[PDB]
Amino acid sequence: SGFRKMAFPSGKVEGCMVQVTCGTTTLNGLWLDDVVYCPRHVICTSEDMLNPNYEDLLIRKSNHNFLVQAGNVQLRVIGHSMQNCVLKLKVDTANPKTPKYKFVRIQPGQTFSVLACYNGSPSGVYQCAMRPNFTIKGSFLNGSCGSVGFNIDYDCVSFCYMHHMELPTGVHAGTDLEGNFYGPFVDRQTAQAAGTDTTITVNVLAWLYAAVINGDRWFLNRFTTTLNDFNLVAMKYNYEPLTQDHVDILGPLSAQTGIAVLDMCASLKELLQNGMNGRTILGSALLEDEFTPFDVVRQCSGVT
Amino acid sequence: SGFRKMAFPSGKVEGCMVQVTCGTTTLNGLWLDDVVYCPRHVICTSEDMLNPNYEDLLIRKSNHNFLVQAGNVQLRVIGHSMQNCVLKLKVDTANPKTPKYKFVRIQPGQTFSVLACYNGSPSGVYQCAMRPNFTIKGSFLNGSCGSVGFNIDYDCVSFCYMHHMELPTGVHAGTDLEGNFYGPFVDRQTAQAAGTDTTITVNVLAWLYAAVINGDRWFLNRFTTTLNDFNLVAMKYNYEPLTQDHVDILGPLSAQTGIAVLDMCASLKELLQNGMNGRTILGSALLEDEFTPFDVVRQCSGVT
Ligand SMILES: COc1ccccc1OCCNC(=O)c1cc(=O)[nH]c2cccc(OC)c12
Ligand SMILES: COc1ccccc1OCCNC(=O)c1cc(=O)[nH]c2cccc(OC)c12
């Protein structure tokens, strides 16, 4: 028993982190096979960030201007190309620690682990979720760009995020491993504001199932509701609308606990309408929305 | 900016996890040099757990009864000995992935990362704290015993915890790497209850400094207090008494923010007396006590 914000083991990803320097800027890169992936803003000076023309900036760069270091050994760059907002630095050596991998673009509401890095060295690992407004609430300082987000399926690392920037609001923006930003964000130091940060309803419900499985049942009530009635309440509290697909995905948690999805929805409805009254659920005083139904099942079953 | 419950990268520890089987029981072991460390309750049947005599149980065991597997390869056991509540299985091969390590016994209030494992395979990593009642609020299922707690100092892994059991209350008990339990717990399936779980005051204050550093300042007030006045309030809310050593340790956070430790104590006092009024601090609706002053400085400075 017990329920923690758990990240995937980071070893397979640690073996891919490298340092990429271009001019005076040093950030992180991801070394997979004979390619190093990094944010293209590595080629910018802090002055350039206000309005950079990356194609023009890239013309002044050659293979030898990109310094790639894995541990204390320098990698030889034999090619460079821009794919959307990432640079792909072709190196002459394939990473001997390359795990089985995939590049996946995630949907809002999905979760992933972040291995925060500075100067190509891992400093920590934590669990995140892609917010419905396509930001992530990470923990990143200067030098963290190029840190990646990932999921692990047994021995296969699915890379889903690469860190690019912090918005003036302190939230984080980035791309998938093909260089496309999540959301409307651009790699420019400009007025960019995130939209409404709505609560991931399907994740909150999954976390209520985890609480029931772990013994916290005070919030269970004698009521039920309908998808339409529940969503009237969800909209008022800036919660994502619950769909029949979400009910279906919550199916195995409903089967495990014997509590119907709509019954759990009515408990959530009352928690939204009346608050927690000074009580806690899984050691938290608010409704947690950064555990998907898959994370709850995985944590409550022991998937290694 | 941003503040997350961050665990250390787990790679160095993943390379030490092995599976140890004795009879029908399989748990995790820690392979360092030519020794595999595991809970001694590996030699027990579920019947034995009610009142095991480990010396008598160990007499019936030989080197060949302890099956040690690292990945898909079997390790040859050439020795076995009991040190307090851990077994030390001498293997004929030194772990080639052994990192620089130390065995340290931690104080209550200190934090560490846990790499939860099942069948010698890592499933997840999370951050924990040794509670003042010597329990940890982990996330562990059947098969997780032998999972370890650790801290990392650059390239040196300081092992501090080995998981042994879950108390009837759902909290977790375990030992240091020399086999001595944290707290009064014994490796017996018996009526064992944890004492009062007090709040680690020095950690809450450090997390209030992290909140100020990250922009959350609503709780800052026009008041100050004294160590004695603060502790009168701390005792009433089952908070650990704040000492001059704690004030000293909070020194660099006080210097960084310009907020005196006693001023932060008065803000905490008002938060205890009046609650958060529906507001949040670092995305939390309660006072977080599982970040030491060192964790806050590390996370807010970028220690890799
Ligand atoms: C506005 O900056 C950019 C705009 C578009 C594209 C890139 C931009 O930044 C590049 C450098 N960013 C970081 O290293 C940075 C990332 C982060 O998540 N947190 C920080 C916290 C404090 C200071 C920081 O940088 C000085 C960071
Ligand atoms: C009362 O048991 C013991 C007493 C003393 C010493 C050892 C005891 O347990 C040995 C086996 N323990 C685990 O594998 C176990 C550990 C854990 O933290 N959570 C669980 C959650 C559900 C089921 C579980 O085991 C069947 C566990």
Swiss-Prot record, chains A, B:
Record location of the Glycyl lysine isopeptide (Lys-Gly) (interchain with G-Cter in ubiquitin) cross-link: 5, 90
Residues annotated as domain Peptidase C30: 1-304
Outcome of swapping residue 90 to R: In strain: Beta/B.1.351
Effect of residue 205 to V: In strain: Zeta/P.2
Domain of life, source organism: Viruses
Record's catalysed reaction(s): TSAVLQ-|-SGFRK-NH2 and SGVTFQ-|-GKFKK the two peptides corresponding to the two self-cleavage sites of the SARS 3C-like proteinase are the two most reactive peptide substrates. The enzyme exhibits a strong preference for substrates containing Gln at P1 position and Leu at P2 position
Topology, Cytoplasmic side: 1-304
Protein's cellular compartments: Host cytoplasm; Host Golgi apparatus; Host nucleus
Regulation of this protein's activity per its record: Inhibited by pyridone-containing alpha-ketoamides compounds 13a and 13b. In turn, alpha-ketoamide 13b (tert-butyl (1-((S)-1-(((S)-4-(benzylamino)-3,4-dioxo-1-((S)-2-oxopyrrolidin-3-yl)butan-2-yl)amino)-3-cyclopropyl-1-oxopropan-2-yl)-2-oxo-1,2-dihydropyridin-3-yl)carbamate) inhibits SARS-CoV-2 replication in human lung cells. Inhibited ex vivo by michael acceptor inhibitor N3. Inhibited ex vivo by compound 11a and 11b.
Effect upon mutating residue 49 to A: Does not affect ability to cleave and inactivate human TRMT1
Residues at the active site: 41 (for 3cl-pro activity), 145 (nucleophile)
Function summary: Cleaves the C-terminus of replicase polyprotein at 11 sites. Recognizes substrates containing the core sequence [ILMVF]-Q-|-[SGACN]. Cleaves and inactivates human TRMT1, preventing tRNA guanine(26)-dimethylation of tRNAs. May cleave human NLRP1 in lung epithelial cells, thereby activating the NLRP1 inflammasome pathway. May cleave human GSDMD, triggering alternative GSDME-mediated epithelial cell death upon activation of the NLRP1 inflammasome, which may enhance the release interleukins 1B, 6, 16 and 18. Also able to bind an ADP-ribose-1''-phosphate (ADRP).
Subunit-structure text: 3CL-PRO exists as monomer and homodimer. Only the homodimer shows catalytic activity. Interacts with host FBXO22; this interaction promotes the proteasomal degradation of nsp5.
Name of the protein: 3C-like proteinase nsp5
UniProt organism field: Severe acute respiratory syndrome coronavirus 2 (2019-nCoV)
Shown residues in whole-protein numbering: 3264 to 3567 of 7096
